[PDB]
Design a binder for this molecule. Sequence first.
Ligand SMILES: Nc1nc2c(ncn2[C@@H]2O[C@H](COP(=O)(O)OP(=O)(O)O)[C@@H](O)[C@H]2O)c(=O)[nH]1
Ligand SMILES: COc1cccc(-c2cc(NCc3ccc4[nH]ccc4c3)nc(N)n2)c1
Ligand SMILES: [Ca+2]
Ligand SMILES: [Ca+2]
Ligand SMILES: [Mg+2]
Lengths: 61, 425
Amino acid sequence: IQKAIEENNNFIKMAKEKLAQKMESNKENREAHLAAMLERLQEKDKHAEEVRKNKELKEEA
Amino acid sequence: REIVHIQAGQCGNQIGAKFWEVISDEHGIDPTGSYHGDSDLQLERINVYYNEAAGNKYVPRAILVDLEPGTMDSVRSGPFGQIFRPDNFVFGQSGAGNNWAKGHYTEGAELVDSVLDVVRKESESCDCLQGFQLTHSLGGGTGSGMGTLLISKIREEYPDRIMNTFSVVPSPKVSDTVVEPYNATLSVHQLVENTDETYCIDNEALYDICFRTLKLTTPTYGDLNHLVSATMSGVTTCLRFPGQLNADLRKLAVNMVPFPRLHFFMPGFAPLTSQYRALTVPELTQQMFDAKNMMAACDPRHGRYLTVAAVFRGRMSMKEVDEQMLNVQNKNSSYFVEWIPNNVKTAVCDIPPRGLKMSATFIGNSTAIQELFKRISEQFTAMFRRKAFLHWYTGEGMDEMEFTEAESNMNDLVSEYQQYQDATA
Ligand SMILES: Nc1nc2c(ncn2[C@@H]2O[C@H](COP(=O)(O)OP(=O)(O)O)[C@@H](O)[C@H]2O)c(=O)[nH]1
Ligand SMILES: COc1cccc(-c2cc(NCc3ccc4[nH]ccc4c3)nc(N)n2)c1
Ligand SMILES: [Ca+2]
Ligand SMILES: [Ca+2]
Ligand SMILES: [Mg+2]
């Protein structure tokens, strides 16, 4: 009976951990995807501010 | 000399209920517990199975056990439901799910102490406890698993008392589930150590008898239990009624069990019923030694008798039974071991069972009972070599060596029967 309790508890333990593991890795992965998406768009805005600044130097000619 | 009765599980409680119905009728006790009989011979040994309660009421010395309340509620509502002591109903709620492990280790262990409490209260009220009898099946979980657990616990508190059982052996022709060979093999190993007498009631034989001999196309468990209750009545007649036989459980065991492990008996009954023609003494003796009247699906001509006991009921020529009993000896003299002289016993009870002028009960300790254990062992190994359906058991904490050990012990039991079957003087 002690063994039976031991197995039921371990099955619950392994399940609780593996689930928590999966849904921490998934949170990390989705955040890393959107973080890269925004950083790409923010890098676009730099090139946009640079294009505006390059027009401003030649109109001073 | 009081006996304490225990019935566990679905099968155990139903055949147990019929039993109390039958002997209650024979002793003149009505469903309410009042005596309305004609002869004082009915009461001289009523104390063996009944307590005398206030109001000149007689109450069976029986304990009813199960892990689910279903069958026990049916019993409390049945014909003789109100005769049992209400505090002797001990039940759980979950059940055993036809799992030996649940009855023996997990679910049954939770309830076993409560059952032993009722045993003590019944035993403390015994002038001189003679022993215990258990009714149960070996194929389920409660009667099989918890039943053997109870036996182990009883031998602990009452180590010097006789423990006998009426055990129903499983058969594929009458099967509720597939793990029945597992449960039976685990139970038998317990019975080999912790019982003095086990009457092997084989459902295969009860079905073949109802179908082939009695010509019943669709036998129900009720039809099989009619045979079982009649036999148990016949087996217990030597204690329940007052002949000049001073029969005690230990004395009977001493006379029938030459070796401690070989205590598995073949029951038999005659005539087989479900007519009015008076049966003759030659017919009673010839039928009771016939394979068609045996409750264990084994051929007595495929083995040899260690001991035999024949019980006759009714008013007949005690001389004629002896002549016919001595006659049958010659017709099967090769099938009786010659190294146990005068190993055939005969008893007579003047009181017949209900609606039968003459009957006969047969109790044989034959090495042919080995055929039954081989059958169960084969069904066991067919699954175990592939580890089929084991998860049901390993999930309850059992290791696989417990299955291997139980298997080896039953094969040992088979081999022990074989050495004495070939032994000669
Ligand atoms: N003769 C007879 N055998 C039964 C009956 N019910 C069950 N069995 C046998 O017991 C096995 C099933 O076990 P079960 O009765 O459920 O055990 P439990 O769980 O302890 O009640 C089957 O293989 C049947 O052969 C019955 O009413 N009469
Ligand atoms: C399972 O609980 C019980 C309860 C009651 C009886 C028995 C029982 C009956 C029995 N048949 C009659 C008999 C047999 C050999 C004899 N030898 C001298 C007298 C004599 C009488 N034989 C055995 N062994 N037990 C078992
Ligand atoms: Ca519980
Ligand atoms: Ca206790
Ligand atoms: Mg059942």
